[PDB]
Design goal:
498 residues, alpha+beta, Nuclear Transport Factor 2, Chain: A, seven-stranded mixed β-sheet, six-stranded antiparallel β-sheet, 38% helix, periplasm, SBP, signal
Length: 498
Amino acid sequence: IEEGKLVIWINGDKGYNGLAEVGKKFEKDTGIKVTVEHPDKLEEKFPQVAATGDGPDIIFWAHDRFGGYAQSGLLAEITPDKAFQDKLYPFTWDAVRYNGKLIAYPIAVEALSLIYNKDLLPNPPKTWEEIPALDKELKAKGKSALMFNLQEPYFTWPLIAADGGYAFKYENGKYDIKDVGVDNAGAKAGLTFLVDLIKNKHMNADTDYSIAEAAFNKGETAMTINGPWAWSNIDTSKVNYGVTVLPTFKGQPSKPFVGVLSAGINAASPNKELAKEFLENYLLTDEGLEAVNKDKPLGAVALKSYEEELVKDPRIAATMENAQKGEIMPNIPQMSAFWYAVRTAVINAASGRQTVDEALKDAQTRIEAAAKEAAAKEAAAKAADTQLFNRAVSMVEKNKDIRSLLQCDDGITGKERLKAYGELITNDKWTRNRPIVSTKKLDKEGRTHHYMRFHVESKKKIALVHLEAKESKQNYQPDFINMYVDVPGEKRYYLIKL
């Protein structure tokens, strides 16, 4: 990655010519060249090139893919101040957090809405419960009330979640991956309502994306559930349509999954401050987003000032309302198990191959099984820190010069047993437990650097040890490249220098 310029990757269905115009304005004002590219499979290539210290400085993609990048240490923690954060809707910041850290800037927000035919239905239903009666009325006119894709859980989840289903619990700013909400009472109630619509012939278990789109766009059904990617085909159909809040179920909003197009900074980039400057001062502004939107519509946006302009279009207002009431898509890898399992559950419940309770219990079990590891990854990460600490403690306590600085009680009867432990303030947080931890950065070459501090104590002195270790390409264990000890009243002592 070249220092003093920015390279940006974004998908080829986005407004990349518009983004390139924001880049040319940045360059006009600052002298810094901005190059926008839209390589195919950028989301698969990114983690491969970033790990070698290559790739773009900034990547734009749906927020949920960034959890895996962050787990791999490939995204830099971003540093917007609180004034900047207050310029975006607060829920959007929840979509770009991993391990308690902000790892991308939210740009736009997408979610399913209720799309309705204003000529058949000028007053669409506020509740799911009223849809059976409305269908009876529309059936008498040779129409139906509602058709939408029943094959895919992304489309059926909004109803299943409404009364309390959820993929994984989000609480205290993070996911509890072992806390899955697929076979709880809320999910059962929503899926039973869906299956009852099918049993009562208000919907057909075979309806899929194409069949529902064709019925709505031909004026055969009064409503569908779909997202903003579908609006252009309806425009061509000339159906007189509106877009509105999804119906409530048991008095609770339907909860569609929310996707937040976000901009992440490559952890290996030598241009992190330039990327922040571009993103905060040029892109996430009314003028910057307008330029992107004019090329290809962003939909609803995270930036309050520009969203307040876009909602002149009530369809955009509806996307945002549904998104604010929705479930942010989780950014953790066990969602692959969620999709696989809930897809079978909903198909089987809708076909009658299983009951709702059996279908959802089987799904819940499969997801929990998938979630049983993942402890393992953070456990292994912690054990890597414990190994760095134990190696460093051994080096320090074997060093004659450091023992002397610590005024160790050593002599013919024995050597003093030193204690070692972490700090009371760790990453600016009160930690009475004195934890052993490192922080990580990626260098220009994509190699991981680990930074750790800990105390060593003799009866006479308590010192602070600092170390930096660098990932090895030959060995599992990293190499120490810097290590020093500050003993009060003494000169800093380097065990390893540079």
